[PDB]
RNA sequence: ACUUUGCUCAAAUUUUGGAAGGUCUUGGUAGGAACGGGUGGAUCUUAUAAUUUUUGAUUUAU
RNA sequence: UUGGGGCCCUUUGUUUCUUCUGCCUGGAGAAGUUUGACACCAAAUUCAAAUUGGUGUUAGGGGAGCUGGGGCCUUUCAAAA
RNA sequence: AUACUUACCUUAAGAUAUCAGAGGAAAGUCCUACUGAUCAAACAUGCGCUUCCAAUAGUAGAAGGACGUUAAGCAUUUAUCAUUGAACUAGUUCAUUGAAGUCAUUGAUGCAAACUCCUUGGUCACACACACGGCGCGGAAGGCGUG
C-alpha cells in the first residue's frame, strides 16, 4: 500500500543484518514497497573484517521479508 | 469438645473459614493446598496433633465463637496448654477459649463405639425450641 | 486502529524497541509508518547477548518489532477519549 | 485476470470451480465418495481419517480420525495412536493430502 | 479515509504520508498540541489524591491516654491569604523546576578543549542531531577549531570574579551581619 | 465458504482446542471471531507428557503455563486451571468437538443455500 | 480471585489488569486500553515476567518457588503477530457504576464542547 | 356423549387473564418523539490463505 | 433557644459545588449555579486589566411532588373444570 | 477571524439479526411501527442463588508489592583469538606484531532468612450471646430467571 521512506538513505553505504545471523553491507540503489531492497558492490561482513568477508555480485537484491534492521553508516 | 470467643465472623463459607482456622493453629498442616476437605458424617481426622472436626453456624446467637472438638479428651486439654494462656492470635484478634460446656457430638460416636435415642431427643427438643 | 495512531503520537520522544530477535533498540523516533516499520535516530543498541554499541540512524521492519515502549504521558492522550464529540466533516 | 476486478458472484463461480475443478477437488471427491484420507501436518504425525467438511484455507472438519505420531530420543522410537470420533482442523497445519484407494 | 486531528480537531481530507507530515509539522498544531500536554500534565500535580479514610473505633485505653494529653491549636490562613500563597509556592515550584546549575560551565570558559566539549553543537554524540533540530527558519558561534594560542593569559581585566552563592529568601537574616575583612 | 462459520454455532460446548505449542486446552466455548479467535470460559490446560524415558517436553509451554498464574504449586503434573482464556486464532492447531452433536444440522450453511435459492 | 463476565469479549474488558502470553514464553501484566483488528493492544503499567533456563527443569513434573526475572516498562504497544493468549488478572480501580457515572459526565462535557464551539464560531 | 323419568345414599370451590383501590419496596426526575441526510464511530461480508500481524519455519529435531 | 455528653475535623488550600469574608476560646456568614460562571496553562506585547488559543470544575445528602418497575391484600369482570 | 500568494493532496465496495408463514407490486426480487419462532442489546426487576468485604475487649492482622536493606550474606562457576622469536616436556612460561573486545568479579548463578518501608479494604450495625451447622443494612464481583 505504502512505500517505505528510506529516500534519505539511497547512495549511501549501508548495513542491514540478513536473517538472524548474517549482515550485508552494500550502497543501497533502489527499494520497493515489500521493502526488497536491492544494492551494489554487496560483501557479506563477518568476524574478521578483512579476512572472512567476500563480495557477492555487482548487483545484488534482497526480499524484505529477511530484512530485520537497516543501518546506515554514512552522513 | 473444646469452646471458643472473639473469632472473625467475616468469611462465609465453612470450608474457606475452617481454612483460615485451621491455618492460623497449625501453619504447614495438612491443609494449605486446598484440593478438598473431609467430611466426617455423624456417627478420620482434620489435622494432625489432636484436631478432628470444626463447627461454625450463621446464627446471630452463635456468630462469633465457633467449636472445636478433638480425638480425646487429654489431647483437647493438651491442645489448650500447648499454648499455656498464652494467647494465639487468629486473623485480627487473641482468643479466649475455655472447655465446652456440652460433650463433643462426634466424640460421643467415639464414646459409645467404645445412638439413635441421642438424634430422636435432638428432633423432639429441637422441634420444641422451635416453640 | 488506535494502537498505530499512538506510535504515530510518540514521533520525535525517545523510545525503546524489542526486534523478535532479541535485539533492543532504544532511542529517539524520527519516522513511524502504518505498517509499524519505524526509523530512529541516535540510537544505543543491545545485541540479544547484551553486547551494547550505539549507531547515529536505524530503520527496522515492522514485520521484526516485538514490543515498543513509549514515553508515559501519553496514557492520557486524547485517543484514548471513548466518549468524544467531533464536528462534522468537510464536504468534498 | 486479478481478483479485484471481479464481482461478488463471479467470486462465487471462480471458488466453485476451484473446488469442483482444481488442486482440492482432490479432497472434494474424497467427501462425496465417502473414501478415507491421510493427512500430514507440519508438526510431523499423520492422521488418517474421513472428510465431513472442507474449506478455500484447507481446514476440514473430520469424523473418525486417527492420529498416528512416534517419537525418538537418541534413538530409541516408539509409536503412539490416538484415537479421535469427531474433529476440526485447521488448515495452515497440513502438508500432504493423499486420497486412498 | 480522513485523518481528523483531534488535538487540532480540525479535520484534514484524504489522509497521505505528504499532507499528514505537513499538518503534524505545522507550527498551529505544534502549539495547540503542546499546550495540551502541558494541561494534561499540570493536572496530574493539580489533582489531589483525596484518599478514601477508613475510621475505627477509638479504644478505651488510647483514649484515656489521649485525654491527658492537651489539644494542640491549628492555625488557617483567610481565603484571600490562601490565594495568594498558594500561587507563591507554585510560582517557586516552577522556580525549582527551571534552575539546573550550570556553573561547571563557566568556570571552564577558558579552556583549551572548551569549544569541543561544552559548546554541544560541535561535539561527536549530540553534535550532528542539533543541525537536524535546528528550525525550518521559513522566513525574516564559538567554531570548533579555536587552539590555546588564543588568550594566552586568561587574566588581562577580562574575567568577572565568581557569582557569590545563592541563598533563601525567607532566611535572609540568618547571614552573619559584618564580614570578616574589608572589601573594596 | 467460510468454515469457521460452523465454529459459531458450537458456542456453549466442551471443547479441546489443541495449539500449536502442544499445549491442550479443556474448557466451555464462548463466541468464536471470525479469524477463528477462540474465547473459553472454565479451562484446564496442559501439557501432554512424552514418556520416552524422559524426554524433556516444551520449554516454552512450560513457561507459557506457569506464568499464566493458573498452575497451582501442589500440582503434581504440569496442568493449569483457569477461568476466561482469551486464545488468538493463528496459535490453534486442532480442535476436538464432542461425539454427541450431529454435523448434519450444523454444517449447512446458510449463506450456501441462500445463493443457490435465490438464482 | 476475580470471575470475568461469562460472556466477555476483549472489547467489553478494558482497563482491567490483564496477562498477555507472547510465542517466546514470557509475559506482559497490565491495564489494557486499546487493542487492534489484528489484536495487538496497548498496556498501560506493565512488566515483562521471564522464567530464566536455569528455574525451568523446577518446572518439570516431579510447593514449587519459580524466581521470575521481571522488568519494568510502561505504556507499551504489542504486536498481535507476538501474542499468544490473555488471561485476566485483575479488576478496574473503579466499579461498574463508577465507570457509569464518569462516562454520563464525560459524554455531557463532550456534547458541551459542541455548542461552545459552534456558537463560539457562527457569531464572529 | 347429551337430555328426560324413577329408586337409593341457580348456588358454592379452584386455575388462568383483565380493571380499580390499599400497603410495602425500588428506580427515575430534564429532556424525549417523529422526520431527514453526498453524517461520525462500532459490527459483519468480500477483495484478503502470496514478503509488514489471523490459514504457520521458535515442541530443536536429522 | 440554651446547656451537657459522644464521635469527626488529614477537611492537611480546615468540608473540596464555586467566588468573596472568615475560623481552633470553632463547625460560620454573603452572593451564584450550564446557551452561564469559576479555576488554571500558554504566549507576545502593551506595560499589572483584558486580548487570543487550550485543559478542567459546576458536587454530595434528605424530603415533598410527578413518573417507571416489582411483590402482597381486597373488590369487579371473562374462560375452563 | 478576514483578504492575497505558494506548496501538498482528493470517495475500496456492500450491508445492519435469522428462520418460517400470510399479503401487495410459473420465476426470482422488493416491501408489509404484518403474524409466529429463535437470537442479540439496553433497561428494569427478582430470587432463603455463589464468593468477598480488617484489631480496638487492642499496639494487631489479610492481599499485593519494594525497579528496599542486611549484603563484598552463604554455596558455586567464570575472564579473549591469530602470527614470530627464546626456553621447555615430547603440552607450558616470557617478549614482540595483528584482529575484534557491553559494563560488571563488591559481578553472574543457585539457596534461605530476618528486618524495614509502600498501596489497598464497610477498619458498618447489633452483639460477648453453649451449637449441629443462617434467614441485619449495605457495597464489589458473578451465575440463573421473568418483564
Ligand atoms: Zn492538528
Redesign the interface.
Known sequence: ??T???KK?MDKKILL?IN?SRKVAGILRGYDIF?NVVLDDAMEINGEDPANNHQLGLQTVIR??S???????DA | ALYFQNLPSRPANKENYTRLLLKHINPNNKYAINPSLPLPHNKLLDDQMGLLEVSISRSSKMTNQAFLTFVTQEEADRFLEKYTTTALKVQGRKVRMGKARTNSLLGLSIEMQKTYNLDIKKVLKARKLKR | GIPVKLLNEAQGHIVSLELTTGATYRGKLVESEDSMNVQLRDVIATEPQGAVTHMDQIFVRGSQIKFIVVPDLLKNAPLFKKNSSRPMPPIR | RPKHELSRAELEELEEFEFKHGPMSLINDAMVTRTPVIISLRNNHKIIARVKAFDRHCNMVLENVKELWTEKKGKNVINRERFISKLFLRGDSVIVVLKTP | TRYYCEYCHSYLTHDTLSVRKSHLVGKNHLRITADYYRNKARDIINKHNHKRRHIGKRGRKERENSSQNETLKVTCLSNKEKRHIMHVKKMNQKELAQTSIDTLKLLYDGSPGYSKVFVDANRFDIGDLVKASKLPQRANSRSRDETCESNPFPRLNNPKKLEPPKILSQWSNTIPKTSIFYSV | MKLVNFLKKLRNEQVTIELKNGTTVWGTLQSVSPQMNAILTDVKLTLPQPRLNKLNSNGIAMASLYLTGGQQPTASDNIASLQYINIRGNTIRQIILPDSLNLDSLLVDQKQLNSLRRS | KIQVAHSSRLANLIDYKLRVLTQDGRVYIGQLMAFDKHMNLVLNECIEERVPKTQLDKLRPRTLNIKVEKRVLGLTILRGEQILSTVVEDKPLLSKKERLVRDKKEKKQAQKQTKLRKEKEKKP
Do not use: H, K, M
Request: proline share 6%; charged share 10%; net charge negative.
Open positions: 500500500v505504502s517505505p521512506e528510506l538513505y543484518n538472524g521493502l524484505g521479508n530484512i530485520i534492521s537497516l543501518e546506515a553508516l
